[PDB]
């Protein structure tokens, strides 16, 4: 079997992408953030403390004929965001884009963090990292991909994120009209339970490709591209007017600027971020200063190939028993 589903940015900035997911019987549709940096599919629900739900469509499990309590099981989660969330845990039918999985753990929020309450556009998150990072206890629960796998035509999903525009998550097949040229595959480590890979170098605009290993994660959950301090400093170097801002928290540059592209290596291949991708948008409203979309990972502690790097590309998450990461230009 396969699935396709469209995924639409939640603002004009491309801060985050939501994709509708069908839960229960009859279907409730929720718009979840697919997030490949975490392994929990949680949803705002009829259990969520009222004072903590502002606009989001909740999952009610009592209205699902298919639902069942997973008694014992609780779950608790914090994000790099310092975002957080806890609840208890049902199993229910979940469909994405017409790929159905039964007995998916669906973790139903009793509480949420203020960041999430405030975020009226995201109903919940769908986690797409390795199951070793699932937070349900006492026994971990398999992601929707892991559940799906046994029925997919191929055990893959692909992320075609859009630049200020919709795009598509595909489960079970690779859509060869979606990208240009060939896919390059690189090796994944699940030691930390992430889509963690090593990029091979990088070049800023027209300049030399420097060959220098950048281990990072592929995380459709993060907005910007987080790279080591010297690489970010190198790139921002070719933009006068740009500087670091402890006020606003990273590199900012005049909106009118014309950013150089950014090339990251994937094996012997190369993927080009347009400059225009790397212009996140003016730092507050009407400002002539924009925030940059390349930023220093050094406070985080891990390089993150967020949404700004992924949306330049067609990315294939290959989850055979020796999982790999495919990247093609589009």
């Amino acid at each position: 079997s396969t699935g396709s589903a469209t995924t639409t940015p939640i603002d004009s900035l491309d801060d985050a992408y939501i994709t509708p997911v069908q839960i229960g019987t009859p279907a409730q549709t929720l718009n979840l953030d697919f997030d490949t940096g975490s392994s929990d599919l949680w949803v705002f629900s009829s259990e969520t403390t009222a004072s903590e739900v502002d606009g989001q469509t909740i999952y009610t499990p009592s209205k699902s004929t298919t639902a069942k309590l997973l008694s014992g099981a609780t779950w608790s989660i914090s994000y790099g965001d310092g975002s957080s969330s806890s609840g208890d845990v049902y199993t229910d039918t979940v469909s994405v884009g017409g790929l159905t999985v039964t007995g998916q753990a669906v973790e139903s929020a009793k509480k949420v963090s203020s960041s999430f309450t405030e975020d009226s556009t995201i109903d919940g998150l769908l986690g797409l990292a390795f199951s070793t990072l699932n937070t349900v206890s006492p026994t971990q629960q398999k992601t929707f991909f892991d559940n799906a796998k046994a029925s997919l035509d191929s055990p893959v999903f692909t992320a075609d994120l859009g630049y200020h525009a919709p795009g598509t998550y595909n489960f079970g097949f690779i859509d060869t009209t979606a990208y240009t040229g060939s896919i390059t595959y690189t090796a994944v480590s699940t030691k930390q339970g992430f889509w963690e890979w090593t990029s091979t170098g990088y070049a800023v605009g027209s300049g030399t490709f420097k060959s220098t290993s950048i281990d990072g994660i592929a995380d459709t959950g993060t907005t910007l591209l987080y790279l080591p301090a010297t690489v970010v400093s190198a790139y921002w170097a070719q933009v006068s007017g740009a500087k670091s801002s402890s006020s606003v928290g990273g590199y900012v540059f005049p909106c009118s600027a014309t950013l150089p592209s950014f090339t990251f290596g994937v094996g012997s291949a190369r993927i080009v971020i347009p400059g225009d991708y790397i212009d996140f948008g003016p730092i507050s409203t009407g400002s002539s200063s924009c925030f940059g979309g390349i930023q220093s990972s050094a406070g985080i502690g891990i390089n993150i190939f967020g949404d700004v790097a992924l949306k330049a590309a067609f990315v294939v998450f290959n989850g055979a028993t020796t999982p790999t990461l495919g990247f093609a230009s589009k």
């Binding site: 940096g37 992430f194 507050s284």
Partner: peptide, 7 residues
């Protein structure tokens, strides 16, 4: 802006 950082 309004970055997001999903673990």
């Amino acid at each position: 802006x309004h970055p997001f950082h999903x673990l």
